């Protein structure tokens, strides 16, 4: 209701947000910005920003340093994520030419050397690595599951693949001849990779314990630790490695992290940076630049080590104030595991007060000290926010992440429930709600069906309600995803699907869903609405038009977020 809720939700979404993609058109920053109502690509060279694309896009391919063009990735299916590629000569912004040799497909990742575009894509029958050059399109290799291109140097192509059991393998190929070589580590998963001058692969390896840098030789697969000049990086003992890449001057840039915050290193030496999380690091005009974000700082571009902002959307002081504080707490779970949980105390709610356990998606993702529009809106609306990194989350080692494999709506739901208990027992919460999108929405449905009475009400957006029907509606990448998560078991696919436990729901439920979502399809949700109806269950639903899982306009963001906040405010009335 409140026109107040609406203005805050609108304003939070309206704040401009930027991601750093690279350096192009000689020496200009290439950035993707959620600005002017949607997701666009821009060039930045010290002053005014110049828009490269026409209609909104979803992303751009990673350009090689200085290339004179940008490759836009744009959904041509009204949200179903069948993307087409469009190139823009950086000397003629606004003029696009579609790469017609590439039929629409789910584009997963890509790099542009300036002479060749190398990308991974998913169709109904497969996931593959492709190369498009002066001679046309070539399929370099068929991949086992989600795979992403990380880097290209010379004829060598390096990437990361989720090829089995939740583990991430490294893979290589040749631009000229294609082919596939998969490198698995028995110690953990590779998280980042960049080809060295010596033509070997430098990669971040996340183990049960610490994460570390290694050198993989493509020719024989031998692996050895990589030691850097400066020991700052090694003594930091990172638990995860976000990204790494060689700068033009040959120096190795690494962004690593622990407990939800990251640090920047150049050849092993620490480089001061604003507190929170950082993205890729680029050398621009001899200077270091990166993206930065934190729970109170929308994604922005800054210079290091000063932290001065090059591109930044301003968060209004009043909205900034609605977040009275934040903490990282370690929730005690059913089996004694400690669940790292970020907490946001609303300056507009009392203590104890209305609290929302906002569950992250993925499952391979994490709640860190990074901007979260959903969280900020709840705080502005008067709710404390509890964000737990349930098992399956990234950021706390290989072991914690892999526990979810073969156990959806099992141990991780116990962690979500423990975070709820902690909220109550610690004195923060007077009443509890659960809210989440994607895997998080799945968790809302799992909570309401398997833990009736735990929460007062639940919000489920772009959620999974039935693994079976979703599977039958999935492309090659998502079918493989579901097989890995469920261990390939039909029993698990069925028993862990909320659609088969509707009778147990007792709390009000709000369903929010983009009509053309191709990751978590709408069809099974319509069946869920039928069951709720037939069983006399209380519920509301909001289906968003011409949109899918990847929101790319400010108005669509309002359509998926506003109903959620209105629903909770109304429940809060009792
Ligand atoms: C209510 C929440 C709506 C989320 C929809 C987000 C659509 C675009 O997503 C945003 O793009 C920016 C530009 O690259 C990034 O800096 C932001 O981190 C990212 O969320």
UniProtKB/Swiss-Prot annotation:
The keyword Hydrolase applies. It catalyses: Cleavage of an N-acetyl or N-formyl amino acid from the N-terminus of a polypeptide. GO terms for molecular function: omega peptidase activity; serine-type endopeptidase activity. Coiled coil: none annotated. The keyword Cell cycle does not apply. GO terms for biological process: proteolysis. Keywords: Cytoplasm, Hydrolase. It comes from the Archaea. InterPro entries: AB_hydrolase_fold, APH-like_N, Peptidase_S9_cat. Its EC number is 3.4.19.1. It is found in: Cytoplasm. GO terms for cellular component: cytoplasm. The active site is at 438 (charge relay system), 517 (charge relay system), 549 (charge relay system). Disulfide bonds: none annotated. Belongs to the peptidase S9C family. This enzyme catalyzes the hydrolysis of the N-terminal peptide bond of an N-acetylated peptide to generate an N-acetylated amino acid and a peptide with a free N-terminus. This is Acylamino-acid-releasing enzyme. It comes from Aeropyrum pernix (strain ATCC 700893 / DSM 11879 / JCM 9820 / NBRC 100138 / K1).
